[PDB]
């Protein structure tokens, strides 16, 4: 049971490094630009809801 819990924690920190891999992926892509356009229009919608 002890090793099982340890393995679950180990999986979580390994998947933490998978987040790092994804961070490098987003900031590479011109999704960095294109999803910023999406954020722009989302804020336009948000600020219009005021």
């Amino acid at each position: 049971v002890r090793y099982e819990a340890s393995l679950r924690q180990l999986e979580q920190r390994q998947l933490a490094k998978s987040v790092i891999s994804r961070v490098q992926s987003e900031l590479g892509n011109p999704k960095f630009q294109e999803k910023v356009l999406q954020q722009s229009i989302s804020e336009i919608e948000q600020l219009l809801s005021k």
Partner: protein, 499 residues
């Protein structure tokens, strides 16, 4: 697996909320930041920085607001955007905190999932008025006979435990929690105590031992542990007792009886001292800031035996003061002493000279104790405090007092002292304490040679239970001794003593 569920939770977070206002940090360091804007801020609000750290605005000044960082400086950065939480500093309160270690913010450092809490309640809340209070009457049985006769403690009662560093200071309180395990493993809500152990200024390692100890004695399930370790930031430590008391007040305001042990308010003083100095507010007496009295008093008075009209509330308070080599004259100790009613001064000399627990009886008082005290323990406790202040006097001049009267007292006194001693982390039942005090008071303990007193205690108790536990059950319910019960006990005590 669990990762998939966490990822589901991650999918479950995504805001779109508008920020009412932010600020931008100016000069920052000394655990205070000076922010520009925050004009619509409430006083003592919680603000969350974009480092994710949260702080409480303390000084609202014309044109600037000065946050106090509840959290490390390293995280906070210059010209960072400070967002208003919008709420006065509150902490989650509820029924689900039992058996959960939490840090001061209420984060689950136990890690038994996100805390189950009914509400949140403001960190500072005014103490109930005169009209809300009602005089104490119910006992708290610590399982340490001295701390149940010599100092009786009751429900909702303010009291003080003062003494020298790490003499297992903590153990004295732990024993109370342990003793009331059987009362709390009761089904009577009135006799249930929900005990909160506030660990302030203690090593995170030491706290981990404590938690494990409590879980070894399986006492965790009725108790909350709040933690503000030495590593944890000085402002977090400052707000730590106040936050703990809020949780306690939720129980108190459930009418439920509880206890909160604040270990150590002496460390709260050092923390507040640090904070004050870092706020560049002028040092007070003994270099402890001038509002240190106010700090303690506001904390302490939030513990009360609320009147039956207002709920019958109780929240007993035991605050643990670490004297620097004794000497109760000392600004921080005296300030505390004045607030508290009763003291349980512990003597280092006696501790060294193998009296565990080392309860100095010269400097232990209980200024409201006798009301709490059970009638059984009033009857059997026949001015034992006086008697052992005759022992105290007798041995003062013994090294003269060669009078047979003094010697008789000395023989009783020394032997009585042996009875007081109790092996820590093994507390005696209240019912069981009644005969022991009967024996010694009624002087049947002169009939026991000093060396064999320890044997006598266990054997006497075994004898009584076997002979007739009927008596013990009777005093267990009656809580008084009739002339017959008293005689039966006298007779029975004579029987074992003889044997």
């Amino acid at each position: 697996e669990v990762s998939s569920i966490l990822e589901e939770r991650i999918k479950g977070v995504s805001d779109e909320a508008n920020l009412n206002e932010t600020g931008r940090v100016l000069a920052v360091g000394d655990g205070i930041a000076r922010v520009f804007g925050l004009n619509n801020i409430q006083a003592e609000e919680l603000v969350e920085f974009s480092s994710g750290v949260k702080g409480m605005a303390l000084n609202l000044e014309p044109g600037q607001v000065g946050i106090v960082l509840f959290g490390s400086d390293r995280l906070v950065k210059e010209g960072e955007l400070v967002k208003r939480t919008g709420n006065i500093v509150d902490v989650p309160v509820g029924p689900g905190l039992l058996g959960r270690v939490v840090d001061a913010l209420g984060n689950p450092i136990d890690g038994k999932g996100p805390i189950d809490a009914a509400g949140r309640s403001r960190a500072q809340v005014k103490a109930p008025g005169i009209l809300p209070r009602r005089s104490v009457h119910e006992p708290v049985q610590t399982g340490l006979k001295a701390v149940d006769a010599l100092v009786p403690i009751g429900r909702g009662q303010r009291e003080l435990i003062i003494g020298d560093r790490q003499t297992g200071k903590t153990a004295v309180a732990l024993d109370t929690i342990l003793n009331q395990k059987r009362w709390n493993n009761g089904s009577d809500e009135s006799k249930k105590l929900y005990c909160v152990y506030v660990a302030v200024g203690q090593k995170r390692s030491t706290v981990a031992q404590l938690v494990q100890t409590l879980e070894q004695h399986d006492a965790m399930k009725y108790s909350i542990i709040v933690a503000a370790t030495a590593s944890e930031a000085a402002p977090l430590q400052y707000l730590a007792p106040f936050t703990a008391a809020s949780i306690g007040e939720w129980f108190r305001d459930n009418g439920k009886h509880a206890l909160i042990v604040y270990d150590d308010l002496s460390k709260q003083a050092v923390a507040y001292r640090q904070l004050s100095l870092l706020l560049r507010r002028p040092p007070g007496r003994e270099a402890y800031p001038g509002d240190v009295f106010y700090l303690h008093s506001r904390l302490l008075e939030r513990a009360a035996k609320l009147s039956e009209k207002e709920g019958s509330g109780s929240l007993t308070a035991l605050p643990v003061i670490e004297t620097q080599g004794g000497d109760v004259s000392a600004y921080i100790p005296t300030n505390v002493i004045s607030i508290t009613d009763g003291q349980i001064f512990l003597e280092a000399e006696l501790f060294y000279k193998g009296i565990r627990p080392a309860i100095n009886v010269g400097l232990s008082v209980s200024r409201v104790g006798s009301a709490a005290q059970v009638k059984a323990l009033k009857q059997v406790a026949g001015s034992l405090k006086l008697f052992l202040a005759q022992y105290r006097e007798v041995a003062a001049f013994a090294q003269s007092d060669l009078d047979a009267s003094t010697k008789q007292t000395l023989v009783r006194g020394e032997r009585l002292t042996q009875l007081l001693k109790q092996n820590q982390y093994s507390p005696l039942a209240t019912e069981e304490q009644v005969p022991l005090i009967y024996a010694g008071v009624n002087g049947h303990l002169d009939g026991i040679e000093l060396s064999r007193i320890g044997e006598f205690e266990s054997s006497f108790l075994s004898y009584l239970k076997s002979n007739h536990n009927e008596l013990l059950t009777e005093i267990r319910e009656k809580g008084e001794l009739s002339k017959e019960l008293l005689a039966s006990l006298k007779s029975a005590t004579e029987s074992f003593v003889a044997t």
